[model samples]
Target chain A: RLFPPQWICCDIRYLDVSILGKFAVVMADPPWDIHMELPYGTLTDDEMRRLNIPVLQDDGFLFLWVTGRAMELGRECLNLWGYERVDEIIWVKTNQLQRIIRTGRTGHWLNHGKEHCLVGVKGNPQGFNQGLDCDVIVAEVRSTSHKPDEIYGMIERLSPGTRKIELFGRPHNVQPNWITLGNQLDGIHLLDPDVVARFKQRYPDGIISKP
Target chain B: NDYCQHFVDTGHRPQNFIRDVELIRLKDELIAKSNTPPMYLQADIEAFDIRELTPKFDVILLEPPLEEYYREKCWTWDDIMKLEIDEIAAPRSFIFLWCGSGEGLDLGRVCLRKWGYRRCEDICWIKTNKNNPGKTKTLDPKAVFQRTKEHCLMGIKGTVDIDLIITEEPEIGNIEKPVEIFHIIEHFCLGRRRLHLFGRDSTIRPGWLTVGPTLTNSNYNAETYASYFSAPNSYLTGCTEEIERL
Candidate 1:
C-alpha cells in the first residue's frame, strides 16, 4: 500500500475534502498535542475532538498511533467520538541491520524503540478477520513518522478493506487506498473524482448540503 | 406484548398517544367495554430552532439532546434568548429542561439568565429496567456505571416546593422522557393545560397535552429512518439545528 509522493502532511482538520459519508475503518498517526511544534503542527485536545463521528461509520474501527506520552489524548479522541478502546498494537522497532537500535540519540530519559497503535471500536463491530495474529507486531524501524510497512501490511490483512483512512500522514511514498490526510497532502484527496461529483449532485446549487 | 408489558402498581399504562391516536378517537369503542375517556401541540424542532414556540405553556418538560464530547460549541447555549420559553408562562410555571449529566448546572444558569426564570433544579430519571430494576441504568447495556440514572436540568418560573424530583421508569426511547416528570409538574403546575414541547407517545394525563414527532415510534424524519443502522444513533444525532445557532 505505497504510491508516489504518497505521504500527506496537512492540517489534520481540513482532511475531509469530499462528503465522504462514513468510513468503515479509520487509521491515523496524529501529531499528538505537540508542545514545541516540531515541524508537524500541534493538534490541541479540542482539535482532536473535532475529529467527530461525522466522518466515522457508527460500526467501524480506528487504529490510532499514540506515543507513550500522548496516549491519554489519543484515548480522548476515541472517547469524544463514542469509541471504546478495545486493544493496542505495539510496534517494536529494530534497526535496518536487524538489531535493536538505540531508542533514539535525541535525548531520552529511557531508550525506547516501541510505540503503540490503539485499536478502538465503535458500536459493536461484527465482521473482522477472526484470524488476527496477537496484538503485538514486531518490525524494523524506518524514518520518523514512517512506521514500518510491516505494520501497514498487518493492518490491511487484519482490518476491514474497502474504505479506509490514514490521518496525520507522515508523507509516505504511497499507499493505494488509505485516505491519507496531512499538511504534506496538498492538492490530493486520496479519493475518486466521483466523490466530488456526488457532492455536487447532493448540492446542485452550491457548496451547501444542509444547515 | 412482552415489550408492551409494564409491571407497575395500579397498572398505570401509558398510551402511545400518537400510535394509539386512533384509539382516542374510537373512545366510543371503549365507552361500553372499558369506559376509557377520549384523549389528545407543542413543537419538537429538530434541535431547538430556538424558534417561535406555542403561546402559554404552564409547565414545559423539554429535554434538548445531550451534548457530544466531540462537539466544538455548545450552541445549545446560543441566541437561547430566542426560545423565550418563559414569556408565555401562565404565572408561577416551572420549566423542566433535561440535559446531560454534568451539564445540569450550566444549562440551568443559561436558561435562567436568558429567559425570565429562576430556581434551578436538577431531576434525574432514576431509570430502571423493568426486567432489571436496580440502579440508575442507561439505555446502553455496555455502559459500566450509572448507565441507569438519567439526568434532567430544571429552571423554574414559579414558587414550587419539590422535596425530590427523581422518579423511576424503565428506559423507553431516545429523548422519550419519563411519565414521572408530569406527576411532579402536576403537583406544581400553575395551570391545568400544560404543554410538552418535545413529547412522546405516552400517558398524556387528561388535561396535559403534547406535540412532537414520536421519533422512535413514528417516522423519525427521512434521513434517520433511512440510515438508522449505518449511521449509529442517527435518530437523535448531530447538531444541525445547533449548527445554525452557532
Candidate 2:
C-alpha cells in the first residue's frame, strides 16, 4: 500500500502504468539478455522504450543501466522516452573483502570492471532531494543481476518524491516506497469491455482506494 | 616535495613554467613576459571565469575545487561551460580536468558535455600512505571498498593528438602531480608555447616562465602583487582598467 495506485497490483501488461499518475522518477532494470546471459525479458531497444515511456512524467528523470558495450544503445532511449541525456553515474564494484576488482572477461572490447547508469531528465527536473553528488558508487557486486539497495536508496534520496516505480523489479529485492513491478512486462491481457467499464465506474481515479 | 626526476626521465626538458600564486592582480602585468600565445595554458585560480583568458591556449589543465573545498561558492557546471570553458576552447585544443570521486565525477561529465569535450581517456592517482610507504588509501569505507584514487579526466576539444599513453601514478600526500604528467603534457605541446596555472609544491624547478609561494603560502595576495603582466602578456594580466578598479 505504500506504493500508491495502491491496490492496482496485477501483471505489468494489464493496466497502463500512466494511470497511476506521472512519476517524477523511473528506474528500469530489464533482464537485458547481454550475450544471452539471461533467457528472460530480453527487449530490443525500441521495444524497451515503448513499454516504459507511459509511466514517465513529462518532467521526470530516467536511470537505465548500461554496459560498456551498450553505451550507444542505452542513450538512444532518452529521446524516445521524452528525456534528454543529463549525466551518467558509474557504479565501481569491488569484491566483498573491499578489494578493487578490475579486468573481468568481456565479449566485446576491454575487460568488464564496471557498470554505469545513463541519467536523463525530461522537462526541468524538480531540483535535488539529497542534492548530494558523487560519480562513483563503490559497492561489491553482490549478485550479477541484483543491484545494490544503495542505488535504490540513492534514487529515493536524490529525488525525494513518491512518484517512483521499479520496472522489472526482482521479487526478492522489492524495495519499500517503490511500485516494484515484476515480469509480465509488455504482456497486456485481453479484458471484457463490460468488466473494464464496471471497474472504471467503481474507481474513477483508476486506482483502488486504501480503506 | 619536488618530483623532478620523473620529468628528467622523459628526455623533454622544457622549462617547468608553473605559476605558484593566484596571479589575478598581475594577470594584467605579465604582458612584458611574452606576447605570443601559449601552447599550454594552466589556470590554477580557485574560482575564476573560464570564458576569458588565453585566446591562444592549445591545452588547458584545470582542477576545479570541490564544493566542500569551496563551500557554497562553487560555480555551477552550466556556467562552467557556456560562461567560459566551451567558448574559449578551439576545436584543436585539449581540456584536462581533475574531478573528485562521487558527485564531482557525476557533474564533471555533465559539465564536459556542456563544454562539448569528448572523454577520450582518464588517468588516476593511486594515493599511497606517506607514513607507511606501501599502504594504499582512499576516501570513505562503508562501501565494498575504501576509496584510494583520484581521477584525471581527459577529453578532446575538437581535434588534435590522440596517441598519448594514459597511465596511473603512485603518489604520497596530495596535490603534487607526477612529473610524468608534465612529460606527456610537454610531448603534445613540444616546441610550441606552453603555460601552467595553479601551482602547489614545486615551481621554477627548471624550465618555463612563471609565479610562486603557491598553496603553501597562507597570506598570499594577488591584488597586492606588484608586476608580471606588462610587455609580456597579450590576453590577460594586471593592467590599467583592472588595477584601477581594485
Candidate 3:
C-alpha cells in the first residue's frame, strides 16, 4: 500500500525521532518559553537546544516557526541542528475586517502583526521546486498558535511527492502526505511496519515523558 | 473577500510588483538629482554630536548597525538611544528607524520613547529570494530560525499615514532596503528637509542629508545644506509628478 498520513501521539522526549526514518522536509512549531502566561506548555531553552533534530536527516529542509523573545533562540537551534540558515517566510496577520491588526498581545512594546518561519537546509537536498510562491504570506489569524493553512500549500509547492513530517502538531494540523507528531493527538497510528517494529522494540511499555 | 485589500487600502499597488515604466522615471530622477545632489557627512555616529547638525529635518531615517549580526564591535542600540535626536528633528517630524527581526524591535521602541516620540506605525519589508530561494546573504550563527523580514519602526514627534508594507528582492552583500520606502515617506511628509543616518554613498539622494562613516567624502556645511533647499521647489517631495500619475 502507498504511504498514508501517519501520526504518533507520543511524548517526543522519550520517543527517538529517528525511528520514523528520514524525511525530505521537516516542520516544527515549538512552544518556546516566551515567559508570558499561556494556555499550553513551553519547552525550555536547554531542552530545545538538546533536541536530536540533526539525526533525522542528513540532507533536508527544516521549517521552524518563531515569535516574540524566541526569535533569536530559534535561529540558534537551526544552526546547532547542522543546518545552514537560508530563507525566511513572513505571515502578515489580518482581522475579520480584512484590515491589518492594530492590537496584538504578543509584543512587549509594540503590537506584533506578523510571524516568521525560518527556512534551514542541510547537506545537498534534491527534488526541490523553486519560484512557485513569493516569500510573503498574507493570512488571517486563527486559534492560539495555529498557523494558517496557506503554509501547507507553500510547502507542498516547494517539495512535492516527498516524505514530510510536522512536529508539535495538533488535530487541525493533520494532513495527507504528512506524518504528524504531537502530544495533543488522541492515539498513535504508525503505518510503516519497520517504524512500528522499531518503536515497539524501543519502548515495550509505552511512550513516557522521560527515558 | 479581497484578502489583500489592506495593501490596496494603504496605497500599495500589487500589480506594480512587475514593471519597466519605472526605469525611465528613475533615469529622469537621476538627471534631476545630478543638478542638485544631496548633502552627506562622513563621520562615525559615536563621535559626531547630532546637536551640531543645525537643520531641523521633517523626516529622519536610521539603519543602525545591529550588535548581534555585525561582526565588528560597532555602535550598539543603547549607544544610538543616547544620541540627541531632539536637537536635529523638527517639532512635528517623522522618524523611520530600521530595527532587525530580533531584540531590536523591543529596544527600538525604548529608543523612540527616550527620544520623546510616540510609536505610531511599523513598516515591514518582506525579503524574497525567488531565483535561489535556498540561499541568503547572512545568517546569525546563534539563531534557530533565519529572519526573512526587517522592521522599519516609524515614530512620530507629531503625526503620519498608513502604507506600511514592502516586498522586494534583497541585494547581494549589504542591507539594501526597497526604494518604495521613499514613496511611503514622501506621500505623507510634506516637509522637504530630510535626514538619513548610518547611510552609505549609494543611499545619497537630493533633498536629504545623509551622515555615515562609510561615505567616500564629507561635504557638509550648515550654509551649503540650507542653500540647496532655499527655493520653494528645491527637492523631491513624496512621489514624483510622473510617479503620481503612474
Candidate 4:
C-alpha cells in the first residue's frame, strides 16, 4: 500500500526503527537547527545528527523538505543521513509570506521570495520498479513547517504503489495509506469527535482518548 | 557680419569651423581625397563613430547602457561581451567609463589593454543605494529598501599627471562628486582641449569647466554629492527644526 492506516504518534527519535525498516519510501522534514534565536524549540546540530534514520530496503527512495534559509543545514543533514543529492524542487508559496528577515539591511528574505525543496535518493540506480525518477515539483507552504499536499501528490504520481511513511507529521494530517511517526500529539489535538467515534468503533476498547 | 548678427539674435554660438568638421561634408571630402575606389568602407571605433569624424580625441567618455537595459532589449550577456570587445579596438584615448556593482570590471580591464590605455585610480560616486537589487537574500536583506549610488571608472593614455585638488568638504544629501575627478581630467588634458559627452550640470569643476550644464543637476543635490566627496570622518547631523516641544 502507498499509505498505511496505522499512526505511530510518538517521537521518532525514540521510535523502534525495526518496525519501519522495510519501507520503500520515506518523507521527512526534521526540525533542523536555525543556529540563531527562534520562537519555537529547535534542535542543535548534534541533536539533529543523533535522530534515528530508518534504514530502507534495497532501491528505496527518500524525500526531504528544506527551508530556504536553512538550505545549507538541510544539505548537511542529508549528507549525515548518507543520502546522495539527486534533484531539487522549489516550493512556491501562494498564501504564505515570509516571517523573518535574516539577511539584508531591511526586510527578511521570504518577504521578497519563495521557499525551495531539495530532493535526494539513498543509493545508486535510484528508481522504483516503475522506472520513475524524481522531478522538480513546485508547491506552496501551507502551514508552519507544512509543505503543500501537491508535493505529496507528485511523489505519489512518480512512485505509484510504493510504501510511504512521513516522519515528524502532525495529527489529523494523515494520508490514506501512509504511516506517520514522530511527535503527533505535541501540538493542538487534531482528532475531532466524529473521527474519534469512528476510531472507538474500530477499537471498541476505549483505548484512545477524545481529548 | 550677417552671421555675427544671427549669432547675437539667436543667443547661440556658431559651430567652430576651425575645430569642428561636419561629418557629412568630411565623409565626402575623404572620399574625394582617397585615390583608391571604395567598395564597402566601414569605420569602427569606441563610443563615437570614426567615419563621422576624426579619431584624434584626447578623452573618450563611454556611458554604455546598463546590463538591465540590454536585457530588456533581449540581448544576452554574450552580446554585451561582444560589444566590449568592439570598444577595445578604438584608438588609444583617455577612457572613462561607468561601472555598477563591479559587474563589468573584468570586461573593463580587457578593454583597457585592447585600446592601449593604462589603468588608473577609480572615483567612487557613492550613492545612497544600489542600482540593481541583489540576488541572494543572505547578502543584502535591505536591498529592497535602499537607493543606488553612482560610481565612475578612470583611465588615462600615455604619461599623464593625475593629481586631484581637494577643495570642497563632503556633506550629506548632496550629489557632488570629489573635486579630484574633474581636477585629474583637467590636469591631463590641459591646453589639449577635451570634449564632455553625455554632459551633466556638475561636470564643470573649478579648473575644468564644462561647456554645458554641470553634473550636479543630474538627479543629485550638492549635499548628497558632498557626502561622497567628504573625508571619511565627516559627521552628519539630523535636522530638528520641525520637532515640537512637548
Candidate 5:
C-alpha cells in the first residue's frame, strides 16, 4: 500500500524502481563502514553503490551525513553514487560532553567534535541567493545520529517546495512528505492507540495547549 | 474574567510591568556588581560563574558547545573529557543546543539527557550565498571555502511550548540565532521575562530581554552579527540608500 505523499516502509535497496525519478531532493545519513562495529551483513559499501543506480533528475540534490572518521569512505561512496561534491556543511556540537570518544584526540591531534554534511548535486548546479556566507557554523548535536532539524530547514528554505526524502531514518524524524527507511520500528509508538490515549489525556485540549 | 475584560478594554497593554528606566538601572547595577573592585573578572565572561548573582533569571539562552576555536593547551583533552555531564549542564533554566551537523545532533542528545531536558524540535537558518564570492577548485583541497547556512537546536526544560519562528535574509554569516529563537521563546513562554546568558552584541527585541553583553566593539558588533535582528524594513531600507550615498 502506498502512503501519500508517498512513504515506503521497506528496505530501501529493494524499493520499487519506479519511484527513482520522482525525488528532487534526497537527504541520506547512511551508516557507512558497516564492516566495523556493526555486523558486515547489516549494510556494506557494495550496498551503497546501489544508491547511485537509481537516476535522479538532472537538478536533484543529495545531502549525505558523514563522520570525520568516515570522510574517505563517504567521499568514495558519493563518487560511486555519481554525485559531484559541492560543499561540506559542518555541524559543530556546542556541548563538549556530547562528543564521541572514538574520534576524540589529544596532544598533537585535533579533537573530533563536528560532523560533516557532504552535499552533492546530481546534475548542473543551481545557484544560491548571494546573502549567505559562513563556512564554519557552530551547532550543538541533538541525537546519536539524527541531523539537526535546522539542516532540513536550511535545505527547505534553499530549495523550497522540493520533494524530500531521508535515508536511514529513525521513526520520530519522519515528516509528512518524506521517504524514510531503516530502523522503521523505532517510531511505532507514535501510531499506538494507548500512546495516543495517554497523550490526549495529558493534553486534554491538544498538544498545542501544553505550551 | 474581569482581569481578562480589563486587559481587552485597555488594548492588552501590559500593566504592572517595570518601566524600561528601572530595567535599565537594574542592568547597570548588575553590571556594576559584576565589575566590583578587587573582584577580578574572568577574561572570558563565559568562564565566569554566573550563579553568584541572586534572583536567577527565568530564561537563560546559552549557545552551547562553546566555540571550538578557543580551546588551548591549558584545557587538555583529558581534562575536557573528564568533565562530568552535569558540569556542562550546570547552568540555565532552558537550553538550546545548536547542532549544525550529524555529530552535533549526537552531542545535543547526550547533553539534553544529562541536563534533564527533553528533545523538542529544531530551527534551521538557511542562508543565501549573496555577499560571498564563489570559489573555484584549487590544487590544495583544504582551501578556504564559503559556507552559507547554520542550524539551531531547540529544547525545553520541564513542560514548555516550543515556538520556532523562521526568518530569512539575503546576506548571511555570523548572524544571531537567539534573536529569532528568543522571539519564539517569548511568544510561547510568556510574561516577557527572559535573559540571554551568553549574550551577543545584538539588542533585545520586543517581548524579549537580554543579560550578558549588551555592547562590544568586537566582531560581535559587526554588521554580520547584528544583521539577524535588523528589522526587515530597516535592512531593505538601508542597503540601496547606503550604496547610492557611497
Candidate 6:
C-alpha cells in the first residue's frame, strides 16, 4: 500500500509539477477530444502536446491510454514529450460476464474491442525486471477512462520499488505507492511535507481550479 | 480463476539484451580515445578557487554535504552560495545541485541565480527503505512531517534537456547519490568536460572530473585536463541515425 495515498486538486495546465518531484513510472489517461463530446471536459491537441511531462521523470516508462482518433495523436505526444516509442500494450476489454467486449460505446467506425496503451521510454532505465508481464492485457472494462488495475500490477512488477504518478486521475484512480493528480479530486492532500510546503508557497491563497 | 492474462510478444524481447549490457560495459573504452580523461582533485573547496581550473564543463553536479545533517564539513546555504561556480561552468552548461529537503529547496535557486544560471527544473529523489518499505528510518525527529526524499535543483546556464532521472540504488549510507545520474547527464549533455563537486572516491567516473576534500588520491593535471577539451568536443556528439531510429 502507499505510505499515504497522495493527490493534488488543481488544473495541471496551470500547476507546475516540479513540486511533486520526479517519478520512475508515469501513467497518463488523457481526455482527448476525438471529435466526440466526452462527459467530462476534453483537452485540445495543442494543450495535450504542451503538458509539462518531460520534467516528471528523466528515465522511465510512460503508459499512455489512447483510443479512436487519439491513437496517432498519442504517439505524436510521446515524441513531443521526449520519449522514444518502445512497446504497446493492447488491453482487450471484457464485459461484466468476463467475455470479450463486443460493444464499446467509444469507437469510430466499428465497435472498439481493445484499447491501446502505448508505452514510451526515455533513457534506458536499469533494474527493470522486464519480461515478467506481456505486452497484452485481458481485463473487464470499467468506468469511462478507468484503466484496469492490472496495469498498475504490471508496472510494479516491471519497475518495482520506484516512484510512480498518474496524470488526469480521478478518485477511483488513487492507489498505494502512486501519486494521483486531477482537477476532480476532493482537495489537496499531499503526504510529502516538502511538496506540501512548496505547493502552499506557490499557491499562497490555496488552489481552487473552479472557485 | 484469473480474469486477466498477459501475452508476450517475441519482437519485444531483444535477443541482444546480455550482449548490449556487455557493450555498455566497454563504452568507456570506446570513448576513451577521444573523450576527456576522467580525473579527480583532493582539495578543500573553501580554499581552492575553482577559477584556477582551466577546462570549463558542460555539466556540473554539486552534491555538497548540507549543514542540516549536522556533519562537521557540511556546507551551509551561504557557504555554498559563495563558491565560484560561474568561473568554471561553460557558457552553455547544466548544473545538478542536490539540495537538502529543507530550506535548500528555495535557497538552492538563489545560489543558482547568483552563479549566473536559471532554475530549469527540480529533480526529486524519493527514498524508500527496501527492507522496510512502509517505515522510513531517515525521518527527522524535530520536523512535524517525515522527510523521506531529497531534492536536486537542476539549473541551466544556457540550455538543457528534460529533467528527472530515476535511480533505483539502495541508500547504503548518508549522502551517497545514485550513479544513474551519470547516465542521464551523459545522454543529454554532449559536452565531455563534466565536473562533480564535493565528490568522493566512490563518486568518481571515467568521463567526469570530480573534486572534493573526501577524495584520497589526486590525478588532476591542469595541463592534461585542459588539453582534453581544447579541441572541439566529440565525446558524446549524438548517436547514429540507426540508433536514434531504433
Q: List per-prediction Cα lDDT, in the order shown.
A: 0.48, 0.47, 0.70, 0.42, 0.44, 0.68
Predicted structure 3, TM vs. truth: 0.59
> Candidates' DockQ values?
0.01, 0.02, 0.05, 0.01, 0.06, 0.07
CA-only RMSD, every prediction: 22.4, 15.4, 11.0, 23.3, 21.0, 16.3
Chain A TM-score of model 1 comes to 0.78
TM-scores of all models?
0.41, 0.45, 0.59, 0.39, 0.39, 0.47
lDDT (C-alpha) at residue A40 in model 2: 64
Q: Which is the leading candidate under DockQ?
A: 6
Scanning candidate 2 chain B in windows of ten residues, the lowest lDDT window is B12-21
Model 4 lDDT on a 0 to 1 scale: 0.42
Report the lDDT tens digits of candidate 6 across residue range A25-129.
Answer: 999998898787657788999989989999999888898998655656787899899986555565556665545554525221124455667777887587786
Ranking of all candidate structures by their DockQ, best first: 6, 5, 3, 2, 4, 1
lDDT of 3 by residue, B1-246 (tens): 322232223323222231221364564454354334578999878887887776688788987767544532456777888888878888887798988766566568778878878766666776544343344334454333335567787778864223345455445445667776766665553466788898889888775788998999988999877765565444545335322212
- Second chain TM-score, each model: 0.50, 0.50, 0.72, 0.39, 0.46, 0.75
lDDT of 5 by residue, B184-223 (tens): 4443332212434444445533322333433343322223
Q: Write the per-residue lDDT of candidate 2 for residues B26-142, one digit (tens) a residue.
A: 522433232332122233443545443433345556554444232113445443444356655656666666665444555565666677776654444433222332233332321
Tens-place lDDT per residue, model 2, A1-211, is: 2442212344443446544456667787665545456556576655565674645577767878775325545665666667765555555555665444566353321234456676777776655542233334546677667775667656765666465766776665554555556654322221334434655665577553332
Which stretches of model 6 miss by more than 4 angstroms? Answer: A1-211, B1-34, B68-72, B133-144, B159-173, B232-246
Give the worst 10-residue stretch by lDDT in candidate 4 chain B: B12-21
Q: Which residue runs does candidate 1 get wrong by more than 4 Å?
A: A1-10, A15-18, A104-109, A170-173, A189-194, A199-211, B1-246
**TM-score, cand. 4:** 0.39
The superposed Cα distance between candidate 5 and the true structure at residue B175, in angstroms, equals 24
